[PDB]
Structure 1
Amino acid sequence: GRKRPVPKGATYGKPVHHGVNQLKFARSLQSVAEERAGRHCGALRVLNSYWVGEDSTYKFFEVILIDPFHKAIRRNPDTQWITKPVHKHREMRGLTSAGRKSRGLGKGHKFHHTIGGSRRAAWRRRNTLQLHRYR
């Protein structure tokens, strides 16, 4: 997990925020692993990834990537979706199956903390004052 990057463990707040050393970083490690793979290769588009070993210190993932500008990708209209410019850098927005597990979305009674759009798109709609015109 992550250690809170704060000098000498002094967080300077109320005692519920003395959390230096039990903090857990709510996005997954595989989503971290895809994120620094598609960051190095910003010309590449990232599809998803999987597990290929873990030691005690390191964890190894094979990340699969897609060149949007090669003609075996820019033809074949069942592959043309990724070369459409809304899919630029999918893991920095949290769109892949490794990364979309961390947003907590899905249908159900267990997942309607995000029942409009995303997590904070629910929060903005729950916490807006919807005063009408004739009220």
Structure 2
Amino acid sequence: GAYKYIQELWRKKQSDVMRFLLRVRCWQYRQLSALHRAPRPTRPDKARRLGYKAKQGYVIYRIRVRRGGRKRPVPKGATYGKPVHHGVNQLKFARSLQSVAEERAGRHCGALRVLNSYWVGEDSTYKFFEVILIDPFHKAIRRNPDTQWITKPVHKHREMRGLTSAGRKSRGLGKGHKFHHTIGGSRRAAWRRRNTLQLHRYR
């Protein structure tokens, strides 16, 4: 009854009723730490449509990342190579900051499983996300077999292999003529199948 109203109020996030609450929450979260346990989701509709259910074993981490592109870590801005690569100031890091937040949350807590994550704040520098974490060894998650897929050990650390929503969106895989660079599996699998010099017994 309510979540469509919550969604439509969150959509136009530039209006005066929302931007006050957004500025107050950005101040409140900027004065907090970097990675800490929010006891309940601040966006219930978005958390529930990403996969949160109000039961024992689902944990929200509020996490803060720093905006901007990456600087190449070479000393004194020297690359020692051809003029293709002197751009120390500008590389823009093909994974999104949401994926960085998922990596940091799951790597701080490898005992949990990163399901998804969602934006909750920005000012100019600190981008704020909330990451939902499944506890694979709680009994309410090891039962209820619509959830038992994440208990299986092939889903350990989805956030660093690129299996979450922001992970897949950073990999850039989809059906179409816009994705011939990664035709199947991954771009390295496509490179493997397209530069494997295939030979046979009979030629």
Report TM bin, short chain. over 0.9
Mapped to 2, the partners of 1:118 and 1:23 lie a distance apart of 22
Alignment of 1:7-26 (within 5 A): 7-26=75-94
Distance in 1, Cα, partners of 2:115 & 2:81: 41
1:37-86 superposed Cα distances (whole Å, 9 cap, x missing partner): 00011100110000000111100000000100000100000000000000
Distance 2:184 2:135 in 1: 33
Aligned-pair distance for 1:14? 0.0
Q: How far apart, in 2, do the equivalents of 1:112 and 1:71 lie?
A: 43
Greater CA radius of gyration, 1 or 2? 2
What SS is found at the alignment partner of 1:47?
strand
Question: Aligned partners of 1:77 and 1:90: how far apart in 2?
Answer: 19
Whether 1:60 aligns to 2:128 is yes
Match of 1:92, SS state, is helix
Deviation at 1:118, TM superposition (A): 0.8
Per-residue deviation at 1:114? 0.8
More helix by share: 2
| Length-normalised TM-score, structure 1 | 0.98
- State the distance in 1 between where 2:102 and 2:184 align: 26
Structure 1 distance, partners of 2:135, 2:170, is 26
Aligned length: 135
Consecutive unaligned residues of structure 2, counting only runs of 5 or more, are 1-68
Secondary structure of the 1:5 match is coil
Tell me the SS of whatever aligns to 1:36.
helix
TM-score, length basis structure 2:
0.66
CA distance in 2, matches of 1:15, 1:95: 36
- Give the Cα separation in 2 of the matches to 1:59 and 1:51: 8
How far the C-alpha of 1:104 sits from its partner, in A, is 1.3
Rounded to whole Å, the distance in 2 between the matches of 1:88 and 1:57 is 31
SS in structure 2 of the partner of residue 116 of structure 1 = coil
Cα offset for 1:116?
A: 2.0
Match of 1:109 among 174, 177, 192: 177
Once the two structures are aligned, what percentage of the paired residues are identical?
100
CA-atom RMSD in angstroms: 0.6
- 1:1-135 aligned at under 5 Å gives the runs 1-135=69-203
